Nucleic acid binder design. Sequence first.
RNA 1: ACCCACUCGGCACCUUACGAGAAAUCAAAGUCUUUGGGUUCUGGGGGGAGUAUGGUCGCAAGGCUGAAACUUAAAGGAAUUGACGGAAGGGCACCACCAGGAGUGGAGCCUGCGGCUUAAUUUGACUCAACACGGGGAAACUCACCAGGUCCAGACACAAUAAGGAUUGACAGAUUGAGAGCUCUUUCUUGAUUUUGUGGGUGGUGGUGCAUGGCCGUUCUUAGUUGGUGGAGUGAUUUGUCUGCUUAAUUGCGAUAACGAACGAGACCUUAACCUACUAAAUAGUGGUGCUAGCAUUUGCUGGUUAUCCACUUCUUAGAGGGACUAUCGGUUUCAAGCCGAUGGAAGUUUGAGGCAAUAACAGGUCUGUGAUGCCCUUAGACGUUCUGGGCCGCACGCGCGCUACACUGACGGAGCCAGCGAGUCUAACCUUGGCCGAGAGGUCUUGGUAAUCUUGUGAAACUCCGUCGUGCUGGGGAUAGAGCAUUGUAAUUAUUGCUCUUCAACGAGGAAUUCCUAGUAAGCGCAAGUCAUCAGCUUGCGUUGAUUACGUCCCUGCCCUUUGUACACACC
Lengths: 65, 71
Amino acid sequence: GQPVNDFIDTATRHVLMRQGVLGIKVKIMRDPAKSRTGPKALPDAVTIIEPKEEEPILAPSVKDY
Amino acid sequence: XXXXXXXXXXXXXXXXXXXXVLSYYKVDAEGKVTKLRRECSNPTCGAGVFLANHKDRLYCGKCHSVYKVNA
RNA sequence: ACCCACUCGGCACCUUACGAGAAAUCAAAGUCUUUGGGUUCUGGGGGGAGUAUGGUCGCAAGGCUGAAACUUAAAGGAAUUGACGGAAGGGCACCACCAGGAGUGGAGCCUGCGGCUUAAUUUGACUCAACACGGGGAAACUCACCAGGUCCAGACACAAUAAGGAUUGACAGAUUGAGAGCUCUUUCUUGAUUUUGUGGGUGGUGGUGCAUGGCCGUUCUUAGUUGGUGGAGUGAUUUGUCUGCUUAAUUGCGAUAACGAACGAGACCUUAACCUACUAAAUAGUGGUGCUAGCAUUUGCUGGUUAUCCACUUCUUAGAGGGACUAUCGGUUUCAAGCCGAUGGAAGUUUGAGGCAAUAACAGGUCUGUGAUGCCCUUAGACGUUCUGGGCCGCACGCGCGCUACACUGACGGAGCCAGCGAGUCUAACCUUGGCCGAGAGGUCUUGGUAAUCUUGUGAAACUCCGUCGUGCUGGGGAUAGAGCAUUGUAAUUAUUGCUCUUCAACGAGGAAUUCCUAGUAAGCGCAAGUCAUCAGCUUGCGUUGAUUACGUCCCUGCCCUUUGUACACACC
Ligand SMILES: [Mg+2]
Ligand SMILES: [Mg+2]
Ligand SMILES: [Mg+2]
Ligand SMILES: [Mg+2]
Ligand SMILES: [Mg+2]
Ligand SMILES: [Mg+2]
Ligand SMILES: [Mg+2]
Ligand SMILES: [Mg+2]
Ligand SMILES: [Mg+2]
Ligand SMILES: [Mg+2]
Ligand SMILES: [Mg+2]
Ligand SMILES: [Mg+2]
Ligand SMILES: [Mg+2]
Ligand SMILES: [Mg+2]
Ligand SMILES: [Mg+2]
Ligand SMILES: [Mg+2]
Ligand SMILES: [Mg+2]
Ligand SMILES: [Mg+2]
Ligand SMILES: [Mg+2]
Ligand SMILES: [Mg+2]
Ligand SMILES: [Mg+2]
Ligand SMILES: [Mg+2]
Ligand SMILES: [Mg+2]
Ligand SMILES: [Mg+2]
Ligand SMILES: [Mg+2]
Ligand SMILES: [Mg+2]
Ligand SMILES: [Mg+2]
Ligand SMILES: [Mg+2]
Ligand SMILES: [Mg+2]
Ligand SMILES: [Mg+2]
Ligand SMILES: [Mg+2]
Ligand SMILES: [Mg+2]
Ligand SMILES: [Mg+2]
Ligand SMILES: [Mg+2]
Ligand SMILES: [Mg+2]
Ligand SMILES: [Mg+2]
Ligand SMILES: [Mg+2]
Ligand SMILES: [Mg+2]
Ligand SMILES: [Mg+2]
Ligand SMILES: [Mg+2]
Ligand SMILES: [Mg+2]
Ligand SMILES: [Mg+2]
Ligand SMILES: [Mg+2]
Ligand SMILES: [Mg+2]
Ligand SMILES: [Mg+2]
Ligand SMILES: [Mg+2]
Ligand SMILES: [Mg+2]
Ligand SMILES: [Mg+2]
Ligand SMILES: [Mg+2]
Ligand SMILES: [Mg+2]
Ligand SMILES: [Mg+2]
Ligand SMILES: [Mg+2]
Ligand SMILES: [Mg+2]
Ligand SMILES: [Mg+2]
Ligand SMILES: [Mg+2]
Ligand SMILES: [Mg+2]
Ligand SMILES: [Mg+2]
Ligand SMILES: [Zn+2]
């Protein structure tokens, strides 16, 4: 998919030797968190903000200013 | 593949012949020098270059061929 | 006779496993390096071989006893994971079938393949996954093939020749297809650039895709791959990754010695749909106004006018947003994931269609895309290259993709008259409107455009309407062939293509077979783009007209999955 275009660089290189040639194929996948100028995460990613304990009750009452 | 055939007769090349040449020019009894063979009135060939003597034919070789002066 | 409890001794099963084992497994195969209850028998790597020999028993066939030489690095056991089967159980799919549509298979031609022919008819590829494929529509070129002619563009090093010239070129004639000084005659020219030899290079559409890279196709219209902590196992391993249900999906639910995750699917991206909300526009358009034509006249109706001005953004353009999450409701389901129906909605089949796409495999195709490349071959009487000419088109015939037809839901003739995706000329001749001339093809003079500006509203074709014909190989059909005219091109003969007249074939719905397809789809219909000097019956996209039939299954076929067997693991070639 699309994240491929966004996050992985590839290169093929032909390395000519005494016997024949070999194909080097390099693939690098870069930290998307660091994206900088694009999307900062995979389309996959789904973060939930973590609530907060509450200490409720305290029967009514009102503040004045 | 197939290899070879030939109803024969291979073609050769050329030679530039021999000739200890430019004897042509003649100097009299000490020491006046007269040119044999006439030279070229083309601006390109400042009259050092001569004309070969055939028949009808006098011809400038320096002009790689160029021009047909006839006397 | 039957039931309950007990107990000796039987044939067995069940669950455990403290314990054993290399494991499979085992209440003995336990009580074994913490090694001793009694006793009997047999084995000491594989083959050679239960062979030779002697003894013995037998009527015999044979039985018992039973060697060595020599050969050899493994043979063997159990389990694991793969791979594979002409074993079994499940699934998925219009490259499967059901219900059907439109066909192909029959005909004419077009075009590839075989075959034959040939100087040559260059060549790759042969089930799906070779054959309108190599973007492969070849007149030269391309081009590799064939008949023949030039050239070196043979780096460099050493040696040799050699300034008394190493070498170079050529006018005319001869030659030659040729205005190739190819060679020859002849005799000027040139000046250390070459020549000759060896060494070494260099080019090659020469060989090897079974030496390679890269790319691509296929498996795959598939759903699979892995690691952390836990559990099992001495171990390779396994569980997680599973009976079921569910999904297009190892997509999920659920079950659960597993829990929680990552690659792949999904997400993501592109394009088609919806925004009287946002920002705008003489390279897009609308309303008002002026200038103005025509028809009515009573306002009116229908046009002209890239700026005569004013305002707008519904339509067009493209930025930014918004929108859908199978929403609401209800059926159904283990009331789970889901599935179904109704309403709403631009939109509810993964929204439609694509792009991307893991792990692994193949001796799939490509050395003929590459100045990617190993090795082999070849290298001046070239397999380098170029030039002239022919050839890839050759035709008893087999095969594939196609085009056009057999007519009356039609052909012909008037007339109506509507798309979308494209593309176009600088140091050049591309897209072409308009005016004339021409039956046509085309010609000619001008013209706008490097483009939302001009071609172009690309006035496309099927289609619609009024006529002619009237079922007759007919006015359906347009093969084959003759004559003439033009266009591209240096060149049109074997006829590039276009036009006119004439000639008027087979084909009366196509055997056995076989392809493709579920909605703006199928089928019909044209167009633009690729190729392109010229040539589309091909492709790639595009819009126009627009259905019948399923919404299911495992019968055929194909494939994945379990279970199972394996003496395979280079893995059933
Ligand atoms: Mg995806
Ligand atoms: Mg002289
Ligand atoms: Mg056990
Ligand atoms: Mg035990
Ligand atoms: Mg017991
Ligand atoms: Mg032994
Ligand atoms: Mg023996
Ligand atoms: Mg005996
Ligand atoms: Mg005996
Ligand atoms: Mg007897
Ligand atoms: Mg014995
Ligand atoms: Mg014996
Ligand atoms: Mg031995
Ligand atoms: Mg096994
Ligand atoms: Mg059927
Ligand atoms: Mg049929
Ligand atoms: Mg060839
Ligand atoms: Mg296939
Ligand atoms: Mg040629
Ligand atoms: Mg030459
Ligand atoms: Mg040499
Ligand atoms: Mg050599
Ligand atoms: Mg080559
Ligand atoms: Mg291969
Ligand atoms: Mg390869
Ligand atoms: Mg081959
Ligand atoms: Mg399908
Ligand atoms: Mg499994
Ligand atoms: Mg695993
Ligand atoms: Mg799938
Ligand atoms: Mg009025
Ligand atoms: Mg009025
Ligand atoms: Mg708008
Ligand atoms: Mg509705
Ligand atoms: Mg979409
Ligand atoms: Mg290649
Ligand atoms: Mg080669
Ligand atoms: Mg190429
Ligand atoms: Mg390359
Ligand atoms: Mg060659
Ligand atoms: Mg051909
Ligand atoms: Mg064939
Ligand atoms: Mg095909
Ligand atoms: Mg008509
Ligand atoms: Mg005329
Ligand atoms: Mg102009
Ligand atoms: Mg338009
Ligand atoms: Mg008839
Ligand atoms: Mg007709
Ligand atoms: Mg011709
Ligand atoms: Mg021919
Ligand atoms: Mg007729
Ligand atoms: Mg029919
Ligand atoms: Mg052509
Ligand atoms: Mg075209
Ligand atoms: Mg083609
Ligand atoms: Mg067995
Ligand atoms: Zn001269």
